[PDB]
Design a protein around this ligand. Structure first.
Ligand SMILES: *[B]([O])([O])C1=[C][C]=C(/[C]=[C]/C([O])=O)[C]=[C]1
Length: 358
Protein backbone atom coordinates (compact mmCIF):
# COMPACT_ATOMS: atom_id res chain seq x y z
CA UNK A 1 0.00 0.00 0.00
CA UNK A 2 1.20 3.59 -0.63
CA UNK A 3 3.43 4.65 2.26
CA UNK A 4 1.05 7.51 3.03
CA UNK A 5 -1.83 5.16 3.82
CA UNK A 6 0.47 2.74 5.65
CA UNK A 7 1.85 5.48 7.88
CA UNK A 8 -1.44 7.15 8.87
CA UNK A 9 -3.07 3.79 9.46
CA UNK A 10 -0.24 2.50 11.66
CA UNK A 11 0.31 5.83 13.46
CA UNK A 12 -3.38 5.84 14.37
CA UNK A 13 -4.31 2.18 15.03
CA UNK A 14 -1.21 1.17 16.95
CA UNK A 15 -1.83 3.48 19.92
CA UNK A 16 -5.53 2.56 19.76
CA UNK A 17 -4.80 -1.15 20.14
CA UNK A 18 -2.57 -0.53 23.13
CA UNK A 19 -4.82 1.97 24.93
CA UNK A 20 -7.99 -0.12 24.48
CA UNK A 21 -6.23 -3.49 24.96
CA UNK A 22 -7.59 -4.85 21.71
CA UNK A 23 -6.56 -8.53 21.26
CA UNK A 24 -7.09 -8.63 17.52
CA UNK A 25 -7.98 -6.25 14.75
CA UNK A 26 -8.46 -5.85 11.00
CA UNK A 27 -8.69 -2.59 9.10
CA UNK A 28 -9.50 -1.77 5.52
CA UNK A 29 -9.10 1.59 3.82
CA UNK A 30 -10.79 2.13 0.48
CA UNK A 31 -8.75 4.78 -1.28
CA UNK A 32 -9.74 5.96 -4.74
CA UNK A 33 -11.90 2.86 -5.05
CA UNK A 34 -9.07 0.43 -4.16
CA UNK A 35 -8.87 -1.56 -0.88
CA UNK A 36 -5.85 -1.75 1.41
CA UNK A 37 -5.73 -4.20 4.32
CA UNK A 38 -4.12 -4.30 7.73
CA UNK A 39 -4.24 -6.81 10.56
CA UNK A 40 -3.02 -7.06 14.14
CA UNK A 41 -3.00 -9.55 16.97
CA UNK A 42 -5.22 -12.52 17.67
CA UNK A 43 -8.45 -14.03 16.50
CA UNK A 44 -8.03 -16.70 19.18
CA UNK A 45 -5.69 -15.99 22.09
CA UNK A 46 -5.71 -19.53 23.54
CA UNK A 47 -5.01 -21.30 20.22
CA UNK A 48 -2.63 -18.54 19.02
CA UNK A 49 -4.54 -18.02 15.75
CA UNK A 50 -3.65 -14.60 14.27
CA UNK A 51 -6.11 -12.18 12.72
CA UNK A 52 -5.87 -12.50 8.93
CA UNK A 53 -7.88 -11.06 6.03
CA UNK A 54 -10.00 -14.21 6.15
CA UNK A 55 -10.91 -13.89 9.86
CA UNK A 56 -14.63 -13.52 10.55
CA UNK A 57 -15.74 -10.92 13.08
CA UNK A 58 -19.18 -10.35 14.54
CA UNK A 59 -20.44 -7.13 12.93
CA UNK A 60 -23.00 -6.45 15.62
CA UNK A 61 -25.31 -3.59 14.66
CA UNK A 62 -23.36 -2.91 11.43
CA UNK A 63 -25.63 -5.78 10.31
CA UNK A 64 -28.40 -3.12 10.38
CA UNK A 65 -26.87 -1.60 7.24
CA UNK A 66 -27.37 -4.91 5.42
CA UNK A 67 -30.96 -4.94 6.63
CA UNK A 68 -31.49 -1.36 5.43
CA UNK A 69 -30.28 -2.29 1.93
CA UNK A 70 -32.21 -5.58 1.75
CA UNK A 71 -35.23 -3.52 2.75
CA UNK A 72 -34.49 -0.90 0.13
CA UNK A 73 -34.14 -3.65 -2.44
CA UNK A 74 -37.63 -4.91 -1.52
CA UNK A 75 -38.93 -1.38 -2.06
CA UNK A 76 -37.23 -1.08 -5.46
CA UNK A 77 -38.85 -4.42 -6.38
CA UNK A 78 -42.26 -3.02 -5.48
CA UNK A 79 -42.75 -5.72 -2.82
CA UNK A 80 -43.16 -3.17 0.02
CA UNK A 81 -43.53 0.60 0.49
CA UNK A 82 -42.16 2.56 3.41
CA UNK A 83 -45.49 4.38 3.51
CA UNK A 84 -47.43 1.13 4.14
CA UNK A 85 -48.75 0.59 7.66
CA UNK A 86 -47.06 -2.11 9.72
CA UNK A 87 -50.33 -4.09 9.73
CA UNK A 88 -50.36 -4.59 5.95
CA UNK A 89 -47.73 -7.33 6.46
CA UNK A 90 -48.78 -8.51 9.91
CA UNK A 91 -52.60 -8.30 10.11
CA UNK A 92 -52.37 -10.35 13.29
CA UNK A 93 -51.08 -7.12 14.89
CA UNK A 94 -54.45 -5.74 15.97
CA UNK A 95 -53.60 -3.68 19.09
CA UNK A 96 -54.76 -0.11 18.37
CA UNK A 97 -51.43 1.50 19.18
CA UNK A 98 -50.20 0.20 15.79
CA UNK A 99 -52.56 2.26 13.56
CA UNK A 100 -50.42 4.99 12.00
CA UNK A 101 -47.11 3.16 12.59
CA UNK A 102 -45.54 2.60 9.15
CA UNK A 103 -42.65 0.50 7.83
CA UNK A 104 -40.72 3.82 7.67
CA UNK A 105 -41.15 4.20 11.44
CA UNK A 106 -39.81 0.68 12.10
CA UNK A 107 -36.91 1.16 9.70
CA UNK A 108 -35.95 4.48 11.28
CA UNK A 109 -36.51 3.87 15.01
CA UNK A 110 -39.38 6.39 15.02
CA UNK A 111 -42.37 4.21 15.91
CA UNK A 112 -42.76 5.92 19.27
CA UNK A 113 -40.47 4.12 21.68
CA UNK A 114 -39.92 0.50 20.61
CA UNK A 115 -37.24 -0.75 23.01
CA UNK A 116 -33.56 -1.30 22.21
CA UNK A 117 -33.57 -4.93 23.25
CA UNK A 118 -36.19 -7.54 22.50
CA UNK A 119 -36.66 -9.35 25.85
CA UNK A 120 -34.85 -12.67 26.48
CA UNK A 121 -38.23 -14.24 27.21
CA UNK A 122 -39.25 -13.60 23.60
CA UNK A 123 -38.10 -16.74 21.77
CA UNK A 124 -40.94 -17.81 19.43
CA UNK A 125 -43.21 -16.51 16.69
CA UNK A 126 -46.10 -16.31 19.18
CA UNK A 127 -43.95 -14.60 21.81
CA UNK A 128 -42.92 -11.99 19.35
CA UNK A 129 -46.51 -11.25 18.32
CA UNK A 130 -47.49 -10.98 21.97
CA UNK A 131 -44.55 -8.68 22.69
CA UNK A 132 -45.65 -6.18 19.99
CA UNK A 133 -49.36 -6.46 20.81
CA UNK A 134 -48.53 -5.52 24.42
CA UNK A 135 -46.01 -2.73 23.74
CA UNK A 136 -47.11 0.77 24.73
CA UNK A 137 -45.73 3.69 22.71
CA UNK A 138 -44.58 6.56 24.86
CA UNK A 139 -44.92 9.00 21.93
CA UNK A 140 -46.96 9.50 18.79
CA UNK A 141 -45.39 7.99 15.65
CA UNK A 142 -42.73 9.91 13.76
CA UNK A 143 -41.89 12.31 16.63
CA UNK A 144 -38.92 10.82 18.42
CA UNK A 145 -35.98 8.61 17.55
CA UNK A 146 -34.97 5.78 19.90
CA UNK A 147 -32.27 3.50 18.43
CA UNK A 148 -33.80 0.01 18.67
CA UNK A 149 -33.29 -3.62 17.62
CA UNK A 150 -36.98 -4.29 18.11
CA UNK A 151 -37.73 -1.47 15.68
CA UNK A 152 -35.45 -2.14 12.64
CA UNK A 153 -35.44 -5.87 13.42
CA UNK A 154 -39.19 -6.01 12.84
CA UNK A 155 -38.72 -3.92 9.69
CA UNK A 156 -36.30 -6.50 8.37
CA UNK A 157 -38.62 -9.39 9.12
CA UNK A 158 -41.73 -7.82 7.60
CA UNK A 159 -39.84 -6.52 4.56
CA UNK A 160 -38.96 -9.98 3.21
CA UNK A 161 -42.50 -11.31 3.70
CA UNK A 162 -43.76 -10.78 0.15
CA UNK A 163 -40.62 -12.40 -1.32
CA UNK A 164 -41.72 -15.63 0.33
CA UNK A 165 -38.09 -16.11 1.29
CA UNK A 166 -36.63 -16.47 4.78
CA UNK A 167 -34.69 -13.43 5.96
CA UNK A 168 -31.36 -15.27 5.65
CA UNK A 169 -32.28 -16.60 2.21
CA UNK A 170 -33.40 -13.18 0.97
CA UNK A 171 -30.15 -11.72 2.30
CA UNK A 172 -27.94 -14.40 0.70
CA UNK A 173 -29.73 -14.28 -2.63
CA UNK A 174 -30.38 -10.56 -2.97
CA UNK A 175 -27.41 -8.94 -1.28
CA UNK A 176 -24.44 -11.20 -0.35
CA UNK A 177 -24.34 -13.18 -3.61
CA UNK A 178 -24.77 -10.35 -6.18
CA UNK A 179 -22.07 -8.44 -4.31
CA UNK A 180 -19.82 -11.51 -4.01
CA UNK A 181 -19.68 -11.28 -0.23
CA UNK A 182 -18.94 -15.04 -0.12
CA UNK A 183 -17.52 -15.06 3.39
CA UNK A 184 -20.32 -13.14 5.06
CA UNK A 185 -22.79 -15.09 7.18
CA UNK A 186 -25.85 -14.87 9.41
CA UNK A 187 -25.03 -18.46 10.50
CA UNK A 188 -21.38 -19.48 10.34
CA UNK A 189 -21.10 -22.90 8.63
CA UNK A 190 -18.93 -25.68 10.17
CA UNK A 191 -16.36 -25.37 7.35
CA UNK A 192 -15.75 -21.70 8.31
CA UNK A 193 -15.56 -22.06 12.07
CA UNK A 194 -11.78 -22.08 11.79
CA UNK A 195 -11.75 -18.40 10.71
CA UNK A 196 -14.30 -17.30 13.32
CA UNK A 197 -12.51 -15.07 15.82
CA UNK A 198 -13.54 -15.29 19.46
CA UNK A 199 -14.95 -12.13 20.99
CA UNK A 200 -13.35 -10.98 24.23
CA UNK A 201 -15.24 -9.51 27.14
CA UNK A 202 -13.58 -9.10 30.53
CA UNK A 203 -10.87 -11.47 29.31
CA UNK A 204 -13.24 -14.34 28.57
CA UNK A 205 -13.86 -15.66 25.02
CA UNK A 206 -17.42 -15.21 23.82
CA UNK A 207 -19.69 -15.44 20.79
CA UNK A 208 -23.04 -13.72 20.34
CA UNK A 209 -25.97 -15.72 21.83
CA UNK A 210 -29.10 -16.45 19.80
CA UNK A 211 -32.05 -14.10 20.25
CA UNK A 212 -35.23 -12.86 18.62
CA UNK A 213 -34.67 -10.78 15.50
CA UNK A 214 -30.94 -11.34 15.87
CA UNK A 215 -30.30 -11.96 12.18
CA UNK A 216 -32.23 -8.80 11.28
CA UNK A 217 -30.56 -6.59 13.89
CA UNK A 218 -27.04 -7.66 14.82
CA UNK A 219 -26.39 -11.18 13.55
CA UNK A 220 -23.97 -10.85 10.61
CA UNK A 221 -20.32 -12.03 10.70
CA UNK A 222 -17.84 -11.02 7.99
CA UNK A 223 -14.19 -10.68 6.94
CA UNK A 224 -12.25 -7.52 6.34
CA UNK A 225 -12.25 -8.34 2.61
CA UNK A 226 -16.02 -8.70 2.31
CA UNK A 227 -16.56 -5.57 4.46
CA UNK A 228 -14.18 -3.55 2.26
CA UNK A 229 -16.26 -4.79 -0.62
CA UNK A 230 -19.49 -3.88 1.18
CA UNK A 231 -18.03 -0.36 1.58
CA UNK A 232 -17.08 -0.04 -2.12
CA UNK A 233 -20.64 -1.09 -3.04
CA UNK A 234 -22.18 1.62 -0.90
CA UNK A 235 -19.67 4.18 -2.14
CA UNK A 236 -20.48 3.51 -5.78
CA UNK A 237 -23.91 1.85 -6.14
CA UNK A 238 -24.14 2.68 -9.85
CA UNK A 239 -21.50 -0.02 -10.43
CA UNK A 240 -23.93 -2.61 -9.07
CA UNK A 241 -25.45 -4.29 -12.12
CA UNK A 242 -28.54 -5.63 -10.31
CA UNK A 243 -31.09 -2.86 -10.73
CA UNK A 244 -33.25 -3.23 -7.59
CA UNK A 245 -30.14 -3.64 -5.39
CA UNK A 246 -28.56 -0.54 -6.89
CA UNK A 247 -31.76 1.37 -6.02
CA UNK A 248 -31.90 -0.29 -2.61
CA UNK A 249 -28.45 0.94 -1.74
CA UNK A 250 -29.38 4.47 -2.82
CA UNK A 251 -32.54 4.28 -0.81
CA UNK A 252 -30.69 3.33 2.37
CA UNK A 253 -28.62 6.50 2.12
CA UNK A 254 -31.61 8.78 1.65
CA UNK A 255 -32.21 11.23 4.52
CA UNK A 256 -35.52 10.52 6.25
CA UNK A 257 -35.14 12.31 9.58
CA UNK A 258 -32.77 14.74 11.17
CA UNK A 259 -31.79 14.96 14.81
CA UNK A 260 -29.09 17.44 15.70
CA UNK A 261 -26.74 17.36 12.75
CA UNK A 262 -27.39 13.70 12.05
CA UNK A 263 -29.67 12.21 9.39
CA UNK A 264 -31.32 8.81 9.67
CA UNK A 265 -31.16 6.54 6.66
CA UNK A 266 -32.18 2.88 6.45
CA UNK A 267 -29.52 1.41 8.74
CA UNK A 268 -26.85 3.94 7.79
CA UNK A 269 -26.63 7.31 9.58
CA UNK A 270 -25.26 10.28 7.62
CA UNK A 271 -23.84 13.74 8.34
CA UNK A 272 -22.91 16.48 5.90
CA UNK A 273 -19.25 16.50 4.94
CA UNK A 274 -17.05 18.23 5.70
CA UNK A 275 -18.11 17.17 9.15
CA UNK A 276 -16.94 18.26 12.56
CA UNK A 277 -15.05 15.45 14.40
CA UNK A 278 -16.42 16.35 17.85
CA UNK A 279 -19.86 16.22 16.29
CA UNK A 280 -19.42 12.67 14.99
CA UNK A 281 -17.11 11.62 17.79
CA UNK A 282 -19.08 12.97 20.75
CA UNK A 283 -22.22 12.11 18.79
CA UNK A 284 -21.33 8.40 18.59
CA UNK A 285 -20.94 7.90 22.37
CA UNK A 286 -23.59 5.65 23.97
CA UNK A 287 -25.06 8.69 25.71
CA UNK A 288 -26.23 10.42 22.52
CA UNK A 289 -26.60 7.54 20.05
CA UNK A 290 -29.00 5.52 22.25
CA UNK A 291 -30.88 8.45 23.89
CA UNK A 292 -34.45 9.56 23.16
CA UNK A 293 -34.47 12.45 20.65
CA UNK A 294 -37.07 14.44 18.68
CA UNK A 295 -36.81 14.24 14.93
CA UNK A 296 -37.73 16.61 12.17
CA UNK A 297 -39.16 14.81 9.17
CA UNK A 298 -37.41 15.41 5.84
CA UNK A 299 -40.42 15.84 3.57
CA UNK A 300 -39.79 14.39 1.12
CA UNK A 301 -36.57 12.50 1.90
CA UNK A 302 -33.39 13.89 0.35
CA UNK A 303 -31.84 11.35 -2.08
CA UNK A 304 -28.39 10.08 -1.11
CA UNK A 305 -26.00 13.07 -0.70
CA UNK A 306 -22.49 12.32 -2.12
CA UNK A 307 -20.88 14.94 0.14
CA UNK A 308 -21.63 12.93 3.28
CA UNK A 309 -19.95 10.96 6.00
CA UNK A 310 -21.98 7.76 6.02
CA UNK A 311 -21.35 5.48 8.96
CA UNK A 312 -22.43 2.97 11.58
CA UNK A 313 -21.07 1.52 14.76
CA UNK A 314 -21.70 -2.07 15.83
CA UNK A 315 -21.09 -4.13 18.94
CA UNK A 316 -21.72 -7.50 20.48
CA UNK A 317 -20.65 -8.49 23.98
CA UNK A 318 -17.29 -9.47 22.49
CA UNK A 319 -16.91 -7.36 19.33
CA UNK A 320 -16.58 -3.73 18.31
CA UNK A 321 -16.91 -2.72 14.68
CA UNK A 322 -17.22 0.49 12.65
CA UNK A 323 -17.77 1.48 9.02
CA UNK A 324 -17.45 5.01 7.64
CA UNK A 325 -17.25 6.32 4.10
CA UNK A 326 -17.36 9.53 2.00
CA UNK A 327 -18.89 8.86 -1.48
CA UNK A 328 -17.72 12.16 -2.89
CA UNK A 329 -14.10 11.29 -2.11
CA UNK A 330 -14.31 7.58 -2.99
CA UNK A 331 -12.95 7.12 0.52
CA UNK A 332 -13.83 4.68 3.28
CA UNK A 333 -12.65 2.61 6.21
CA UNK A 334 -13.70 -0.60 7.99
CA UNK A 335 -12.52 -1.36 11.54
CA UNK A 336 -13.28 -4.82 13.02
CA UNK A 337 -12.13 -5.85 16.50
CA UNK A 338 -12.78 -8.71 18.91
CA UNK A 339 -13.33 -6.54 21.98
CA UNK A 340 -16.15 -4.04 22.36
CA UNK A 341 -14.41 -0.74 23.01
CA UNK A 342 -15.79 2.86 23.37
CA UNK A 343 -17.46 4.24 20.22
CA UNK A 344 -15.72 7.66 20.41
CA UNK A 345 -12.33 6.01 20.13
CA UNK A 346 -13.44 4.23 16.92
CA UNK A 347 -14.84 7.34 15.27
CA UNK A 348 -11.80 9.35 16.43
CA UNK A 349 -9.39 6.87 14.82
CA UNK A 350 -11.49 6.64 11.65
CA UNK A 351 -11.67 10.39 11.29
CA UNK A 352 -7.91 10.86 11.87
CA UNK A 353 -7.27 8.37 9.03
CA UNK A 354 -9.79 9.60 6.48
CA UNK A 355 -9.32 13.32 7.05
CA UNK A 356 -5.62 12.73 6.41
CA UNK A 357 -6.48 11.55 2.87
CA UNK A 358 -8.67 14.57 1.85
B1 LIG B 1 -25.73 -2.63 18.12
O1 LIG B 1 -24.35 -3.13 18.04
O2 LIG B 1 -25.73 -1.18 18.50
C1 LIG B 1 -26.51 -3.48 19.19
C2 LIG B 1 -26.47 -4.87 19.12
C3 LIG B 1 -27.12 -5.66 20.07
C4 LIG B 1 -27.83 -5.01 21.13
C5 LIG B 1 -28.54 -5.75 22.17
C6 LIG B 1 -28.59 -7.10 22.25
C7 LIG B 1 -29.33 -7.72 23.34
O3 LIG B 1 -30.47 -8.38 23.10
O4 LIG B 1 -28.91 -7.62 24.50
C8 LIG B 1 -27.85 -3.59 21.15
C9 LIG B 1 -27.20 -2.86 20.20
Amino acid sequence: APQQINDIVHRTITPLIEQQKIPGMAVAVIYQGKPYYFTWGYADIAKKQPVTQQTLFELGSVSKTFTGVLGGDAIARGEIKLSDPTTKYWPELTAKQWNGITLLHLATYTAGGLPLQVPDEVKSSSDLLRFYQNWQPAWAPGTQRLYANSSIGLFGALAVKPSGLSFEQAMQTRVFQPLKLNHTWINVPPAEEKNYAWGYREGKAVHVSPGALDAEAYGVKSTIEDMARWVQSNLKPLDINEKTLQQGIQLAQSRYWQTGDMYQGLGWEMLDWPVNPDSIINGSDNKIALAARPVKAITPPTPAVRASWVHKTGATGGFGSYVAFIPEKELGIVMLANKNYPNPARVDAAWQILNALQ
